[PDB]
Amino acid sequence: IESTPVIGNDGTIYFGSNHLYAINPDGTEKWNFYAGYWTVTRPAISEDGTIYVTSLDGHLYAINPDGTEKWRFKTGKRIESSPVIGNTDTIYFGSYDGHLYAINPDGTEKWRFKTNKAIESTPVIGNDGTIYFGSNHLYAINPDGTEKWNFYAGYWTVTRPAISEDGTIYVTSLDGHLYAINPDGTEKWRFKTGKRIESSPVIGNTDTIYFGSYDGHLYAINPDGTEKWRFKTNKAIESTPVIGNDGTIYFGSNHLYAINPDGTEKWNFYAGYWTVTRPAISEDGTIYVTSLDGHLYAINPDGTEKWRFKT
């Protein structure tokens, strides 16, 4: 499976399925990290430049900025959860054994927090260091490894949360709700769509909350829980949207869509015969996406192709 591209602070683009490629912004290959047949996730990158990915066969890899392996942490259990960093360089990821793992920067385990469901989603670190993850419900964990609270969207699984500047926590649920949750874990409001949601919410522009639906619409929800607009496409939106520095809302599905803050279409980018990943956007405004045959595309802000890369 191709991962969402990630842009390091220095502009390097990291992408790939079971190889981790590091690409310079001019489209040349910098290095190639290979860990075996297993897909690795999009990386999280620490303040000191260490690159972390999880592999499907249960490793957390720490990789140096030149692509050499620094260490590996082994669990022997499936990982679909992409790692995140917080609380002074701690690395967290979810396991199919049901634990949230916390790993120290030296590759030793800090703690593991047990749950009764596989954690398939990416954890989220709040400004106060709370670690959140969505699975059979929304879990909030303290940095010390103790439970802070749990929020239930009834019976149904929820996505990883988005957290606003004012501390509101948002998740979507499989049955089609967007939930707004207060910092203390109590429900603020809910918004119903009546169709499946697998897309996670993102916040941008004037605290607006965006998510995709299996009805094929991109939804934009005001912070009071009322609908701002919906944008129709011909295919379920299963991936999570992305907000650029100019407020454009992007999402990847059968092609790459760019939507203006007002809900109108900005442009469409097609990657030939292939569906595409979630995009990444660089500070200079270049958009990156991978097609499912493994082409990394660099796309200018106006929707024209800047370059493409496949090894």
DSSP labels, 224-273:
TS-EEEEEE-SS---SPPEE-TTS-EEEESSSEEEE-TTS-EEEEE--TT
Structurally, how many domains does the chain consist of?
1
29 inside domain: no
1 inside domain: no
Query: Alpha-carbon dihedral of residues 46, 48, 50, 53, nearest 10 degrees?
Result: 0
For position 133, which CATH number holds? 2.40.128.630
| Single-letter amino acid, residue 151 | F
117 inside domain: yes
**Residue span of the structural domain in which 96 resides:** 42-151
- What 3-state class would DSSP assign to 77? coil
- Most distant CA pair in the chain: distance in Å? 49
Candidates 280, 281, 287; CA nearest to 302 is 287
256 inside domain: no
End-to-end CA distance of the chain: 16
Contact present, 52 and 62 (Cβ < 8 Å): yes
54 inside domain: yes
Sign of the CA dihedral with 85 first, then 87, 89, and 94 last: negative
For the beta carbon of residue 15, count every other beta carbon within 10 angstroms: 27
**Residue 23, both tokens:** 């690409």
- Rounded to the nearest 5 percent, the helix, strand and coil shares of the chain are 0, 45, 55
105 inside domain: yes
| Whole-angstrom distance, CA of residue 213 vs CA of residue 291 | 21
For the beta carbon of residue 161, count every other beta carbon within 10 angstroms: 25
Contact present, 251 and 242 (Cβ < 8 Å): yes
Contact present, 254 and 235 (Cβ < 8 Å): yes
Contact present, 42 and 3 (Cβ < 8 Å): yes
**Residue 15, both tokens:** 């992408």
